Structure 1
Amino acid sequence: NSNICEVCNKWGRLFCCDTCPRSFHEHCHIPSVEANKNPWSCIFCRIKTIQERCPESQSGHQESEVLMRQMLPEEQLKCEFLLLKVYCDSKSCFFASEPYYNREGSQGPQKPMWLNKVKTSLNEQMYTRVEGFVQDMRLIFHNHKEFYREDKFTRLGIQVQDIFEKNFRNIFAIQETS
């Protein structure tokens, strides 16, 4: 097994996957690492199994169809993994916890949003369709762009949104386009 957490790249109290060499902090894994279960298989492994059990699941899909999917177990997992892929980027730190807004010339967003809120909402099964999760994720970056205006800090939202979108297209096998 690796000696650092796959998500945050730090050592510490790590839980090791039984079917691959990755390791995790308890609350870095999504869902949080399960109490018992020997062997234990990480989210990366669980996602790989879905693809292996249904190879045709990798054929191209339309985003509009993906968004309307109900949050059955496999879609729940895919959103958990997409969320985790964002937290894998160190720039996710800026979007993790509850923001506050007091900048001359800007007004805060009407609906603030942040990663840990999305994480809780997934854990509490508050999304009934993939669309709910994706909307909240895109809202994080849209709020940031609007608030920061011409400050160069706006670029951090563009950057982390790009990680989200690339991973969304990979995990849900969105049809490639020009």
Structure 2
Amino acid sequence: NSNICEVCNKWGRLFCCDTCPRSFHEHCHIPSVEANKNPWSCIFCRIKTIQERCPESQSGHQESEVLMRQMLPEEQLKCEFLLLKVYCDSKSCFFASEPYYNREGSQGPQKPMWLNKVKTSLNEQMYTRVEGFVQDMRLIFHNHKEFYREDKFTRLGIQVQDIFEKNFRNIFAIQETS
């Protein structure tokens, strides 16, 4: 197994996947690494299994249909994995914890949002449809773009949104388009 966490790329107290060489800090893995379970399979492995059990699940889909899906166990897992893929980028640090807004010439957003809040919301089963999770994730980057205006720091929201959107299209097998 790897000797660094797959998500934050640091050593420490790591839990090893039994079906692949990845390793994780307890709270870097989403959901948090489960207490017992021998063997244990990580979220990358659990997602691969869904795909292998239903190869047709990788045929193209319309985003509008994906968003209306109820958060049954497989869609819950897919959103957890998508959230994890955002945290895997080091630029997620900017969006992880609760932001505050005091900049000359800007007003803070009406509805602040951040990754750890989405994480808690998923853990607490607060989303009933995929749309709920996706809306809150897109809101993180939209709020950032609006607040930072013409400051070059706006680019960080574009960059992490692009990681989100690429992984969304991959995980939910969104029909490829030009």
RMSD, matched Cα: 0.1
Query: How many residues in Structure 1 have an aligned counterpart in Structure 2?
Result: 178
CA-to-aligned-CA distance 1:124-176 (integer Å, 9 cap, x gap): 00000000000000000000000000000000000000000000000000000
Task: Quote the offset at 1:83 in angstroms.
Answer: 0.1
C-alpha distance in structure 1 between counterparts of 2:163 and 2:11, whole Å: 24
Task: Quote the offset at 1:7 in angstroms.
Answer: 0.1
CA-to-aligned-CA distance 1:100-144 (integer Å, 9 cap, x gap): 000000000000000000000000000000000000000000000
SS at match of 1:80: helix
C-alpha distance in structure 1 between counterparts of 2:49 and 2:149, whole Å: 43
Task: Quote the offset at 1:9 in angstroms.
Answer: 0.1
SS at match of 1:177: coil
Which runs of 5 or more structure 1 residues have no equivalent in the other structure? none
C-alpha distance in structure 2 between counterparts of 1:135 and 1:2, whole Å: 34
C-alpha distance in structure 2 between counterparts of 1:38 and 1:108, whole Å: 47
| Structure 1 segments (4+ residues) deviating >4 Å | none
Identity %: 100
SS at match of 1:99: coil
Task: Quote the offset at 1:3 in angstroms.
Answer: 0.1
Specify the alignment match of 1:128 in structure 2. Answer: 128
With normalisation by structure 1, the TM-score equals 1.00
Task: Quote the offset at 1:45 in angstroms.
Answer: 0.1
C-alpha distance in structure 2 between counterparts of 1:139 and 1:9, whole Å: 27
With normalisation by structure 2, the TM-score equals 1.00
Task: Quote the offset at 1:15 in angstroms.
Answer: 0.2
C-alpha distance in structure 2 between counterparts of 1:8 and 1:50, whole Å: 25
Task: Quote the offset at 1:67 in angstroms.
Answer: 0.0
C-alpha distance in structure 2 between counterparts of 1:156 and 1:51, whole Å: 32
Specify the alignment match of 1:91 in structure 2. Answer: 91
Specify the alignment match of 1:72 in structure 2. Answer: 72
Task: Quote the offset at 1:71 in angstroms.
Answer: 0.1
SS at match of 2:52: helix
C-alpha distance in structure 1 between counterparts of 2:145 and 2:36, whole Å: 42
Which runs of 5 or more structure 2 residues have no equivalent in the other structure? none
